[PDB]
Amino acid sequence: GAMDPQFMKKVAVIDIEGTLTDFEFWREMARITGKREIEELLEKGLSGEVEWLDSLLKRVGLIRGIDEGTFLRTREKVNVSPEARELVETLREKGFKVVLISGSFEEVLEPFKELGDEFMANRAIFEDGKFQGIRLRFRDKGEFLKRFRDGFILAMGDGYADAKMFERADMGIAVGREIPGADLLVKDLKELVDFIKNLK
Amino acid sequence: GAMDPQFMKKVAVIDIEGTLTDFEFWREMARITGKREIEELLEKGLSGEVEWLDSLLKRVGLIRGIDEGTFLRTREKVNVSPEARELVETLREKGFKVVLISGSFEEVLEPFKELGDEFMANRAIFEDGKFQGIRLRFRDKGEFLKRFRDGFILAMGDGYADAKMFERADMGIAVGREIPGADLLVKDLKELVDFIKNLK
Amino acid sequence: GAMDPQFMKKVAVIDIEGTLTDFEFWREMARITGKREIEELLEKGLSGEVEWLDSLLKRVGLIRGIDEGTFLRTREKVNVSPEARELVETLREKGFKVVLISGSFEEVLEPFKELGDEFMANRAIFEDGKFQGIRLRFRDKGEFLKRFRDGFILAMGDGYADAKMFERADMGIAVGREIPGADLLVKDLKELVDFIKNLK
Amino acid sequence: GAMDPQFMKKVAVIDIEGTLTDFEFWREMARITGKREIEELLEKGLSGEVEWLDSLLKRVGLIRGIDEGTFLRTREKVNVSPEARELVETLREKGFKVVLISGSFEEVLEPFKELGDEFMANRAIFEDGKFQGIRLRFRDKGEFLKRFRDGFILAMGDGYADAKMFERADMGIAVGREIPGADLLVKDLKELVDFIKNLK
Amino acid sequence: GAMDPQFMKKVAVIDIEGTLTDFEFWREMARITGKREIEELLEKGLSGEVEWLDSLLKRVGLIRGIDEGTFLRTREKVNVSPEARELVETLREKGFKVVLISGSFEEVLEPFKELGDEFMANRAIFEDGKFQGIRLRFRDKGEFLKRFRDGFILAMGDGYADAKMFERADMGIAVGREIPGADLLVKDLKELVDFIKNLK
Amino acid sequence: GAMDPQFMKKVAVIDIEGTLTDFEFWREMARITGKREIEELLEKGLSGEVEWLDSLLKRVGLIRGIDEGTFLRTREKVNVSPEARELVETLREKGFKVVLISGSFEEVLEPFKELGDEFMANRAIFEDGKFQGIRLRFRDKGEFLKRFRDGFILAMGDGYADAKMFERADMGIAVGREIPGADLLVKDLKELVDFIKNLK
Amino acid sequence: GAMDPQFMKKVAVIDIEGTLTDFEFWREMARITGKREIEELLEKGLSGEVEWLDSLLKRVGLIRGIDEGTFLRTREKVNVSPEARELVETLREKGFKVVLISGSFEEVLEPFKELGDEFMANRAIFEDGKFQGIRLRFRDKGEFLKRFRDGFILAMGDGYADAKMFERADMGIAVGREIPGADLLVKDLKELVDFIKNLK
Amino acid sequence: GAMDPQFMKKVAVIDIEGTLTDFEFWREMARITGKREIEELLEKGLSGEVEWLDSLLKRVGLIRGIDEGTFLRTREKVNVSPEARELVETLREKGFKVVLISGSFEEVLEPFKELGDEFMANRAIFEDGKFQGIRLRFRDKGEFLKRFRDGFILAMGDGYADAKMFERADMGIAVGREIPGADLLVKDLKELVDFIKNLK
């Protein structure tokens, strides 16, 4: 093994939210701050009632001023299940290069940061120990996927993904709930790993 | 293994001539027909003295009228060495999709036809048991490589390949004699297989 | 005829199933194995009730364990009718380059392998004499057609083709039943041959 | 022949000057007018000593004021030889669509106007029965060839053609004297027709 | 006027049928042959009830065998009205390069062949003095317009034009009756000429 | 004249420096400050001895701190000669859309700002009445010309222009001294105006 | 600040009408001239009942002959509010390059001409002191935005903007009333400035 | 600061080696292992005597078997100087998005991993506690830069960069020694920081 030509490998992109974990940062924030307008805005954003970015920025503005420590504290509710680790490792076995993405913060989703071969999520701005706003590191997941316009993509996602993300993938798989653009539907992380281990 | 997603695999393209076999069809024809103008034209074509296609068509016109049986007879001088088979099988192990190409005829290079996952060479036209001309199935090897413009390509070739073929590859490897565009140089099929087994 | 410039020729792409043969591998398998869920999944898949790939992989999973010999035997129900041969030979007369495609297996559809100038279908995986799964050699037929994006395409297909395959062709012809995107509709292979002989 | 799908055919483009005719309009004007600066400028333009357009516009300005009729008489020196007609008709038989182009005037090259399937050359401006200037209908022959960028191109040309025109062709043939970009070299129109008749 | 840089000029494309003439070739043939299926098919093709090409080829097959002379006689019902000539000449005045196109035959629309700076229509096949079929010189008018993909286009058309032709134009003008894609609606050729004479 | 369709017009691009004015801002500043390193750097930048941007920024740093008033006073040495105005107005007459560009400052080249239909140059930074640096509004003139990638371009330039600017133009004209890429050479503004007045 | 690399900055494009000013030139002309058909046509054009260009040219034709001075007085109703100036200056502070665009006339919108870094609107034709017609300087706002296809775009617009303009933007913001394609909706210029100030 | 639109920011790409650190991993390894063939291969590779990848893989093969711990220990000679930190933080001030790249290992260059906004380098393969080979995560730095083809790029690099990396950047800055393609040359990191603080 004088070489692993990683750059020539096909890419497995996993949207972390709702595929590797049930944790939903904005619902947790809605609980913590008692502001149900946050979770209402989430619901509106997922249901396509309002434009995604609008809901996101409104929510971001809502939790503004929150303590840094309280914020990072939510990391403890995020966990790399052994099923998730199995999925990633299996994908590597089955010849893929694993890329994990999320709309949420890297600071919250830190356990996954070194799990896959590449990791991208948005970030948080902290002035004087208090939350100020969000660093939007990518426009959306579809646009982000343009980084691999030069290769092939197997995409796995849940209710935080959408058609645009899958219209970039060569093979698209939705988890739990159906998504326009996805080729297959599995019911849960289990079914998904069972599928992935049925490869090559 | 409910699925081998072959279409998402990176592609290993091998130019058969001078990498998997020492057989040179046109030199054999030059010997058989005693026309040294054929081999002279070959030499001129490789050395870039004359434009490749011109030399090729002149040679094609030179062996015109040759017997069908005599023609196909040269197949017996073509052999799938165990080193070659090892190379292909190893490439498949090391995650590639193997594509074999040649400027010569499929009818002569028939043993390799089912070796790799894809096979392309030019063909022969036979009217009344006599050789009439050539079916040019592709313009050149670089242009042919546009079939995989959507993925990555490791290219291995010898003196019948050129810069244009390698300018398409992400990683290019020349065998025996140096080629502009190639990233590496191995000395022989042995060294090449040794390299390939040092992968992933 | 010192040269046939096959690569400059316009391309006639034929979806084998339902144009060159009445044979439907999955229905046949439904008969052999008595698993009617196979033919039900096929029916659902064609009607777009379920996503094509999902139903397909389900069907593959249903026939898992079938004997290799029994599987390859299904080839015996596949035959190159003289009408098909006439169609292909006519297309060659009318200046086309014939490319045969199918979503089904090369192992079953082998008689057609040498009929056209190029042949592509998916393949079968056989571990320990028993059938394990499917090698998907192309993403779909439309995507496959990108191999000839540098020229023109006349596409002929039946119910295993769809809009995506035809939105690539410059001229599209549907066989038997109408397909969104197709320019013309013929009723069967005969009428299609009558059409093709009417060219130039 | 209920249909000729002409638009799907590969394109044979012939640069008229030095391939179908010995006629060189500018040398003729140089003789007619006794201005040898015209033929000198032509020589300079062909040899690439000075920019083509500079020489062309200089020559146009040189013959300015010339009589319309006197101008058009040069047509009488133009003849569609039976060899040329044979070339075109053979190309048609060998499946091509014929496009004739020239840098010179349509008014002079009128006999060729209906020979091929498409015809393009520059034109002449005539106000009050006298030659005023030139209507430049295409930038150059390479740029012109972009009209068929959606298909394949066999290009045949002589010393009024150049690299840019042939860098567009899939197959390039030079007539009489070799040109960078051309794939083949023939010695004359006869040899070229002999070549074309060795096709399919 | 040492130069008219025609190739740099913006292009004014006129769909001849129903803009420069009230003549409708297919209705005329329908009258001549008393076959109302021809005119019914015309109506169906325009209304998009059946695919355009299907209806067209049906009509071509319907009129098959008609006498050559009878066919060409229809030219006599086509006339370059002075209003049309005014339109074209004005367009040249207003800085345009005029290109005339139609789906009908050049043999019929001959008066228009030298009217504009470029002319394209489909053509007719005549074997042994009898009409055999049609040479389709372009796929459609929209596709045809790609010959000018490198510049700007003002497109004018009537009920034989459609949306695809106009989605290529930078400015689209409908005549008589509204068409999806067009920017403007004029009532007749007069109104259009008045519009064009109001330019620059 | 209900409309001037300016956006459909072909574009005439004039590099102001050395075409519309003999004024050279950097030489003037070099005289003013007695720093000959400025003019030496100008010479070096034009001759390609050192990279253009390097020399430019060196000059900018050289002149740093200069008084705002002293800087803008140089406007008084710039004049819209009546020949220049004639050129532009003629270009509009001859169907062009005139765009003026320069590497120098808008603040200096102000008379030209409303001359053509579009105007672009770089600008100056002034903090507390003293010159601080340069706002580079375009990367280079060639890159700038991409704003008109959708149409045609006649480009005219002098010794402050270069090849990259002209490889974008469909027709390029050099003034005074020859530049790689240009099609023509004129000797002065007069000759150029005479050329332009010889159009259409 | 020896350098401002302005060309590398992301672009903030503001559609002036309904974002920076309440001024609606066509309503103003409708009032001035008592032709209510003007404001009716405006309403129809905005609501997409009739094609934008049709309505625009109809309106232009409606106010034809109007006095130049009377026309320009409408400028006096135009004011660069301090909120607007604040918006632009903030955008500059938040790292953007500001481009102001409008469908209306530069002559009316002169106060805004030097506000942003780049300014584009359509223009007016005035022969003999009287309004004749309109110079259309861009096809539409979407097409205009192609000038910055090489970078990123934040677009802010109101009811004179549309989907095409926002489908070009990476981030779209509608002002006052929601527009398909826009990502966010603010209620007024104030809210928008408050948003912009929450950046970086 | 409710939002930082990082994705719309222009990108500053820094090749770490020879810009942010004097550390040269292969030379260090040459010291530790006393194998001077390593440093000889490096020298040959930089000078382009041998193809980069060939020399690289040779070097990898030389250091095969080295202890994992000893390898990772080399990190101790890598340190984020305060000048580097100043550069990155300044780039962020000056509106850039900082992307750190290297051909070397993440394991050695770990201190820089969290310095910029994005970090990419190649990795190490460790089987049974001993070093086996290299994971090539990108083809080369130029190819890597295609991740930001949708925006602008300021590239800073040293002797581990080359022309291909700079022919992608809109503005290129070389450090220490001149590189073909670079626009500017600085002598060391200090002068570069002095340059960067001079922006906007």
CB contact under 8 A, B171 and A8: yes
Which residues 19-38 of A are in CB contact (within 8 Å) with H?
none
Contacts of F185 in chain D (CB under 8 A): 51, 54
| Residue count of chain F | 200
Using CB atoms, pick whichever of D170, D184, D198 lies closest to residue B51. D184
Pairing verdict, β G130-136 and G118-127? antiparallel
Question: Which residues of chain H are within 8 Å of residue G10 when distances are taken between CB atoms?
Answer: 5, 8-10, 151
Beta-carbon contacts of residue H84 (< 8 Å; ≥ 6 apart): H20, H21, H112, H115, H189
G67 reaches A (C-beta below 8 A): no
Report the neighbours of G using a cutoff of 3 or more CB pairs below 8 angstroms.
A, E, F, H
Q: Quote the tokens at residue C16.
A: 């084998």
The alpha carbon of C146 is separated from its chain's Cα centroid by a whole number of angstroms, namely 16
Contact (Cβ atoms closer than 8 angstroms) between residue B55 and residue B39: no
Find the distance separating the first CA and the last CA of chain A, reported in whole Å.
21
CB of C67 within 8 Å of a chain E CB? The answer is no
- Tell me how many residue pairs between chain G and chain H have CB atoms under 8 A apart: 55
Q: Do chains H and B touch (3 or more CB pairs under 8 A)?
A: yes
Resolution in A: 3.3
Q: Which CATH class is domain C21-80?
A: mainly alpha
Neighbour tally for F191: CB within 10 Å? 15
Say whether G183 and A53 touch across the interface (CB within 8 A): yes
Are F166 and F155 in contact, with CB atoms under 8 Å apart?
Answer: yes
Bridge partners, residue C97, by sequence? C11
How far H7 CA sits from the closest chain A CA (Å)? 5
A138 touches chain H (CB under 8 A): yes
Q: Which amino acid is at B39?
A: E
* Region for residue E128 given its phi and psi (left: phi exceeds 0; alpha: psi -120 to 50; beta: otherwise): left
Calculate how close chain B gets to C187, using CA atoms only, in Å.
33
Residues from chain G contacting residue F2 (CB–CB below 8 Å): 57, 60-61, 64, 132-134
Cβ proximity of B15 and B160 under 8 Å: yes
Give the chains touching F; criterion: ≥3 Cβ pairs < 8 Å. D, E, G, H
Q: Do G53 and E184 touch (CB under 8 A)?
A: yes
E133 to C171: CB separation less than 8 angstroms, yes or no: no
Q: Which residue, D98, D93, D100, D102, is CA-closest to D119?
A: D100
Tell whether H54 lies on the interface with B, counting CB pairs under 8 A.
yes
Chain E CB contacts of G139 under 8 Å are 170-171
Q: Which of C108, F4, B132 lies closest to G138, judged by CA?
A: F4
Neighbours of F107 (CB within 10 A): 17
Phi, psi of E28 (to 5 degrees): -65, -45
Question: Is the Cβ pair F135, G6 closer than 8 Å?
Answer: yes
Q: Which residues of H touch B187 (CB under 8 A)?
A: none
CB contact under 8 A, F2 and G147: no
Contact call for residues D139 and D132 (beta carbons, < 8 A): no
Which residue out of C53, C143, C146, C162 would a mutagenesis test of the A interface target, given it has the greatest number of A Cβ atoms within 10 Å? C53
CATH 1.10.150.210 spans which residues of chain B? 21-80
Q: Do G4 and H200 touch (CB under 8 A)?
A: yes
Instruction: Nearest by CB to A54, from G170, G185, G198: name it.
Output: G185
User: Which of E200, D171, C161 minimizes the C-alpha distance to B54?
Assistant: D171
- Chain E CB contacts of G164 under 8 Å are none
Q: How far is H84 from chain F (nearest CA, A)?
A: 23
DSSP-assigned letters across all residues of H81-116: -HHHHHHHHHHHHTT-EEEEEEEEETTTSGGGGGTS
**Tokens 């999709």, located at residue:** B97
Neighbour subunits, A (≥3 Cβ pairs < 8 A): B, C, G, H
- The answer to whether B138 touches B120, Cβ cutoff 8 Å, is yes
Nearest CA in chain C to D154: C8
Cβ contacts from A onto G, under 8 A:
16
What is the C-alpha to C-alpha distance for residues G23 and G38, in angstroms, rounded to an integer? 15
- What is the location of CATH 3.40.50.1000 in chain G? 1-20+81-199
Is there a contact between H164 and H140 (Cβ–Cβ < 8 Å)?
yes
User: DSSP labels for F80-142?
Assistant: --HHHHHHHHHHHHTT-EEEEEEEEETTTSGGGTTTSSEEEEEEEEEETTEEEEEE---S-HH
* Alpha-carbon span B62 to B54, nearest angstrom: 12
Q: Which residues contact B2 (CB under 8 A, 6 or more apart)?
A: A195, A198, A199, C57, C60, C61, C64, C132, C133, C134
Q: Is D64 on the interface with E (CB under 8 A)?
A: yes
H53 touches chain A (CB under 8 A): no
Name the method of structure determination: X-ray
**Which H helix or E strand runs over G92?**
helix G82-93
Task: Enumerate the β-bridge partners of residue C118.
Answer: C99
Residue-wise DSSP of C160-172: T--HHHHTT-SEE
Angle, helix C36-46 to helix C52-62, in steps of 10 degrees: 170
Interface test with B, best of A10, A11, A199 (most B CBs within 10 A): A10
Q: Are G134 and F4 an interchain contact pair (Cβ–Cβ within 8 Å)?
A: yes
**Rounded to whole angstroms, how far apart are CA atoms B143 and B164?**
8
Query: What is the enclosing helix (H) or strand (E) of H123?
Result: strand H118-127
- Provide the CATH topology of domain G1-20+81-199: Rossmann fold (3.40.50)
User: Per the CB < 8 Å rule, is C51 touching A184?
Assistant: yes
Determine B/C contact with 3+ CB pairs under 8 A as the test: yes
List the one residue out of F189, F196, F197 whose CA is nearest residue F19.
Answer: F189
Q: How many other C-beta atoms lie within 10 A of the C-beta of residue G68?
A: 15
Set of chain E residues whose Cβ sits within 8 Å of the Cβ of C185: 51, 54
Tell me whether B149 touches chain A (CB under 8 Å). Answer: no
- What are the phi and psi torsion angles at F193 (to 5°)? -60, -40
Secondary structure element (H or E) that encloses residue F171, with its range: strand F171-175
What share of residues in chain E are helix, strand, coil (percent, to 5)? 40, 25, 35
CB-based contact D92:D98 (threshold 8 Å): yes
> Which residues between 162 and 191 in chain F have a beta carbon less than 8 angstroms from any beta carbon of chain H?
none
Contacts of H134 in chain A (CB under 8 A): 2-4
Q: Which residue of G has its CA nearest to E154?
A: G139
Two tokens at A19? 């595929």
- CA distance, residue C132 to nearest chain A CA (Å): 9
* F51 → chain H, closest CA residue: H183
> Of the candidates E7, E61, E137, which has its C-beta nearest D6's C-beta?
E137
Mark yes or no for CB contact C171/E139 under 8 Å: yes
For residues B154 and B15, what is the distance between their CA atoms, to the nearest angstrom?
11
Largest interatomic CA distance in chain G? 55
CA torsion C35-C40-C46-C50 (nearest 10°) is: -110
Contact E57 C182 (CB under 8 A): no
The Cα–Cα gap between H177 and H175 comes to 6
